[PDB]
């Protein structure tokens, strides 16, 4: 059930069935491509309101702005979104490229989610038991609730950070001005010394500020940032 063409279809809330191997490159403006199998799309499109959903064997390469993203079984995306993102996954893998503003991300499964640029204002990431999120450009208020046995790696230079790890999670944070950390039986690695830092550790919990010793100029912990 293939569909591979470069045209102006432009109005398709297409909830396709299985084996719909649509490698289309058409100008799909009012698009919502909720394919169910075998999507192998390599387009150059423009959507700007896409609430995309993708089930198993969905490899994609698109330069279109989305609004929501849903993953079901297993995927490999490479998308260039622009405006806002409500993203949720299930046991899949995903990558995104351009400057996005992901407000909320809830991953309750094994999700290898990556975003090469996230320029948001308040990114709330909730994680549950299996996922692996690696999103790094620049946030302004990160709230990483890892309720999880999972990993949240970041080189995201957030201005304020609030990371709570609940049961053998592992979160790698980087705070510019405000660092807020609570750990419980888990690990929180601070890769940049904030302007004001505060970390609280529970039972068997490690908020170790694991910056690289011998930087070019590693700034020391000042009188406003020297916590134990």
């Amino acid at each position: 059930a293939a569909a591979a063409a470069a045209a102006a279809a432009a109005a398709a809330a297409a909830a396709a069935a299985a084996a719909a191997a649509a490698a289309a490159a058409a100008a799909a403006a009012a698009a919502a491509a909720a394919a169910a199998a075998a999507a192998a799309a390599a387009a150059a499109a423009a959507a700007a309101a896409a609430a995309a959903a993708a089930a198993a064997a969905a490899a994609a390469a698109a330069a279109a702005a989305a609004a929501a993203a849903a993953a079901a079984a297993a995927a490999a995306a490479a998308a260039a979104a622009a405006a806002a993102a409500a993203a949720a996954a299930a046991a899949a893998a995903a990558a995104a490229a351009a400057a996005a503003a992901a407000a909320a991300a809830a991953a309750a499964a094994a999700a290898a989610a990556a975003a090469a640029a996230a320029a948001a204002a308040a990114a709330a990431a909730a994680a549950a038991a299996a996922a692996a999120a690696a999103a790094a450009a620049a946030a302004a208020a990160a709230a990483a609730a890892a309720a999880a046995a999972a990993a949240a790696a970041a080189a995201a230079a957030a201005a304020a950070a609030a990371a709570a790890a609940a049961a053998a999670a592992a979160a790698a944070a980087a705070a510019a001005a405000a660092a807020a950390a609570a750990a419980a039986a888990a690990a929180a690695a601070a890769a940049a010394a904030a302007a004001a830092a505060a970390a609280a550790a529970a039972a068997a919990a490690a908020a170790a500020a694991a910056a690289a010793a011998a930087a070019a100029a590693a700034a020391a912990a000042a009188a406003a940032a020297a916590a134990a």
Binding site: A187, A201, A204, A206, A209, A210, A211, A212
Partner: protein, 148 residues
């Protein structure tokens, strides 16, 4: 008049030294180099840079033992067994030793310097590598030289 004792007595030095060796904090006494070796089970939680609340009593006769000597520089250095990597490990042991020296100059030392550092199992006192902080390799050591 000039003072005979300097706020300390030798009977109390060996009384704390027997009591610390009975509670398993081993005091080596070589020349004037003093070593007290503390297992990381006896202070912290496992693979954490965080004190337990009861272990400040162990730090109480550590600090009241460190009342008794005239000393110039205490160095406190910590190292544990391998957990994730040597980089995470050295961050752990640096935070570990700097937390216990922050409490030791909250308490009473008459030291002028406490140097404080951590290593990544780079100096392990046994080859038997059972686990995490229950290893006897996983330890902090507080070494100084008693001045005159």
């Amino acid at each position: 008049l000039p003072c005979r004792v300097d706020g300390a007595c030798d009977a109390t030095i060996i009384k704390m030294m027997t009591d610390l060796n009975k509670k398993g904090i081993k005091v080596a006494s070589v020349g004037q180099n003093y070593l007290i070796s503390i297992p990381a089970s006896a202070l912290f939680a496992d693979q954490s840079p965080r004190l337990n609340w009861a272990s400040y009593s162990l730090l109480n006769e550590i600090a009241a033992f460190l009342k008794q000597f005239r000393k110039i520089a205490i160095t406190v250095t910590s190292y544990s067994s391998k957990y994730v990597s040597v980089k995470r490990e050295r961050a752990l042991t640096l935070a570990r030793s700097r937390v216990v020296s922050e409490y030791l100059w909250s308490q009473g030392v008459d030291s002028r310097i406490i140097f404080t550092q951590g290593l990544g199992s780079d100096k392990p006192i046994t080859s038997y590598t059972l686990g995490g902080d229950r290893s006897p390799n996983a330890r902090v050591e507080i070494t100084f030289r008693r001045a005159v």
